[PDB]
Design a protein around this ligand. Structure first.
Ligand SMILES: CCCCCCCC/C=C\CCCCCCCC(=O)O[C@H](COC(=O)CCCCCCCCCCCCCCC)COP(=O)([O-])OCC[N+](C)(C)C
Ligand SMILES: Nc1cc(COc2c(Cl)cc(C[C@H](N)C(=O)O)cc2Cl)c2oc(-c3ccccc3)nc2c1
Ligand SMILES: CC(C)CCC[C@@H](C)[C@H]1CC[C@H]2[C@@H]3CC=C4C[C@@H](O)CC[C@]4(C)[C@H]3CC[C@]12C
Ligand SMILES: CC(C)CCC[C@@H](C)[C@H]1CC[C@H]2[C@@H]3CC=C4C[C@@H](O)CC[C@]4(C)[C@H]3CC[C@]12C
Lengths: 52, 455
């Protein structure tokens, strides 16, 4: 096991950790939007293939 | 205070099973049954046949999951019979290979078919296909962190997209009849490979059992969600096959690598692109259903002590098992590196049917050992024994198809024995491991604000 419910939540509300979790959530979605921008770049910047 | 709450209503329970059965399979797998049947008649019969077999199996899980209400599904039913080690050897293979490879493969099918109408005549660019697979897996592990009501509303929407797509296919088939048996591979050694290659398209029917514990009313809704779905699937499959045979000749289906797309090209002309996109959105639903369900398997495995304790923790304000989801996403993305992928799943042809056979053998032994345990469902013992006997034959067929590859799979199962002895039998005794385990656990609890569930 690890920390109790109350034992965790009295520490996890500290401003450093609250801003850390906000930063990781922002960084994740920024990284996913960046990966979508990358995927769309590759779909545009590729050879639209030979017509029958 | 903190637990996984009972969010899944009956129609969402039907969504979790129909969404993960219908899969990619029916839009690309018909070719595999014609290859071993030769004849549209024999093909359309084995489609019905492995349908009624699948109903018979699911009726045993409709029993089991009312006798044992644990969300471990196929794993919990082993743990409650064969005990600690046999259940772990399952969970190891599910964790390491089967669930993350399955999730990745069907995400890559989502990526390729959703892009396909930009590239009709040629490959979809591979460096794009692997991103559009990863964006899907990352998105659905975000959605299934945010709310089980969001997760199940997503699968309602995509389960609907799938059945709508098959209704459109069936309708155009009847329209082609409105506009106005053959040479059969009658060898039993051909027929058995036809049947065994068709059963793949029904694979998924057990997946509801891994969320038994989150049903609003499991003792009613868990058997009803099976009987409301597998007969519906079986009908839609025989009708969808019928629809293809109105339009594609045997030679064309034996030699086309995306059967639904050819049927799309013949009927919809300028609008043909609709069917590729529906195969895509169809697979997105199957990634979601798998990620959802899969997160509960590892959760349960950690609650029963087989797996590191972080995966049991829940996020108190959202009531989703955030570390189990995060683990499942990462383990899916680690398959993105592999230059080939279907092979690693083909190594375990036998494994799915083996675990099912062991679960229902378990249900026989459980009836002898404890008749006093409560049973809202009590199926005639003929069906379990029929279904077991049939699976023990298909497990042998699975080896006989490729006696090398099922041996490689069986070799990887034994990789579970090192991990079980190190992770369970050794009691983690060295203090430089034990203190580091704890330090990493309390870090993760802090880092994503998660806490143990309350009995
Ligand atoms: C890259 C970083 C990987 C570690 C992420 C740790 C933080 C996770 C966490 O607590 O999520 C949490 C949920 O965040 C999510 O709902 C999305 C999670 C996306 C999963 C991607 C995994 C790959 C982050 O949010 P929180 O700190 O729990 O505060 C609540 C914020 N909301 C969800 C109410 C807005
Ligand atoms: N042991 C095992 C277990 C499962 C999980 O159960 C299944 C599921 Cl979840 C879906 C399908 C295919 C589905 N019925 C479809 O129509 O595409 C088959 C099985 Cl055995 C596997 O999935 C797959 C799989 C799924 C998609 C693409 C390629 C392979 N291999 C599996 C091996
Ligand atoms: C996020 C996950 C779930 C799905 C990602 C799919 C993305 C990569 C796909 C879906 C539809 C696609 C667009 C559809 C049509 C066009 C027009 C064409 O002239 C260039 C590419 C472009 C602009 C595509 C870019 C990539 C695109 C946005
Ligand atoms: C905590 C550690 C294990 C990292 C967790 C995130 C990992 C599994 C994920 C996050 C984003 C992912 C990458 C996203 C995009 C691509 C480009 C693709 O063409 C090849 C794979 C690759 C390079 C992925 C590999 C796996 C990846 C690096």
């Amino acid at each position: 096991t690890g920390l109790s419910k109350e034992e965790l939540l009295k520490v996890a509300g500290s401003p450093g950790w609250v801003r850390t979790r906000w930063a990781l959530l922002l960084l994740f979605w920024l990284g996913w939007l960046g990966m979508l921008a990358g995927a769309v770049v590759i779909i545009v910047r590729a050879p639209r293939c030979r017509e029958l | 205070g903190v637990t996984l709450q009972r969010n899944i209503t009956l129609l969402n329970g039907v969504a979790i099973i129909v969404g993960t059965i219908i899969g990619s399979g029916i839009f690309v797998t018909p070719t595999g049954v014609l290859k071993e049947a030769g004849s549209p008649g024999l093909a359309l019969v084995v489609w019905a046949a492995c349908g009624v077999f699948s109903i018979v199996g699911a009726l045993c899980y409709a029993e089991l999951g009312t006798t044992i209400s644990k969300s471990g599904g196929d794993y919990a039913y082993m743990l409650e019979v064969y005990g600690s080690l046999p259940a772990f050897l399952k969970l190891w293979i599910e964790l390491l290979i089967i669930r993350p490879s399955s999730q990745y493969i069907v995400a890559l099918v989502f990526a390729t078919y959703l892009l396909k109408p930009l590239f009709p005549t040629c490959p979809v660019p591979e460096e794009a296909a692997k991103l559009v697979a990863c964006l899907c897996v990352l998105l659905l592990t975000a959605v299934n962190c945010y709310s089980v009501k969001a997760a199940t509303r997503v699968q309602d929407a995509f389960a609907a997209a799938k059945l709508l797509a098959l209704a459109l296919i069936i309708l155009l088939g009847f329209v082609q009849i409105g506009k106005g048996f053959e040479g059969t591979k009658l060898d039993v050694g051909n027929i058995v490979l036809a049947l065994y290659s068709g059963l793949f398209a029904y694979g998924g029917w057990n997946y509801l059992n891994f969320v038994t514990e989150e049903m609003i009313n499991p003792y009613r809704n868990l058997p009803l969600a099976i009987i409301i779905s597998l007969p519906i699937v079986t009908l839609v499959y025989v009708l969808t096959n019928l629809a293809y045979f109105t339009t594609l000749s045997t030679e064309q289906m034996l030699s086309s690598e995306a059967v639904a797309v050819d049927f799309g090209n013949y009927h919809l002309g300028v609008m043909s692109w609709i069917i590729p996109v529906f195969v895509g959105l169809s697979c997105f639903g199957s990634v979601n259903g798998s990620l959802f369900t899969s997160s509960r398997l590892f959760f349960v495995g950690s609650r029963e002590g087989h797996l590191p304790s972080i995966l049991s923790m829940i996020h108190p304000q959202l009531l989703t098992p955030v570390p189990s989801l995060v683990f499942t996403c990462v383990m899916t993305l680690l398959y993105a590196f592999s230059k080939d992928i279907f092979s690693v799943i083909n190594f375990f042809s036998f494994f799915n049917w083996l675990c099912v056979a062991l679960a229902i053998i378990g249900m026989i032994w459980l009836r002898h050992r404890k008749p006093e345990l409560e049973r809202p469902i009590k199926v005639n013992l003929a069906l379990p024994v029929f279904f077991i006997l049939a699976c023990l034959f298909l497990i042998a067929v699975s080896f006989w198809k490729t006696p090398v590859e099922c041996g490689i799979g069986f070799t990887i199962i034994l990789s579970g024995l090192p991990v079980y002895f190190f992770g369970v039998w050794w009691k983690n005794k060295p203090k430089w491991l034990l203190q580091g385990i704890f330090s990493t656990t309390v870090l993760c609890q802090k880092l994503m604000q998660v806490v143990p569930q309350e009995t």
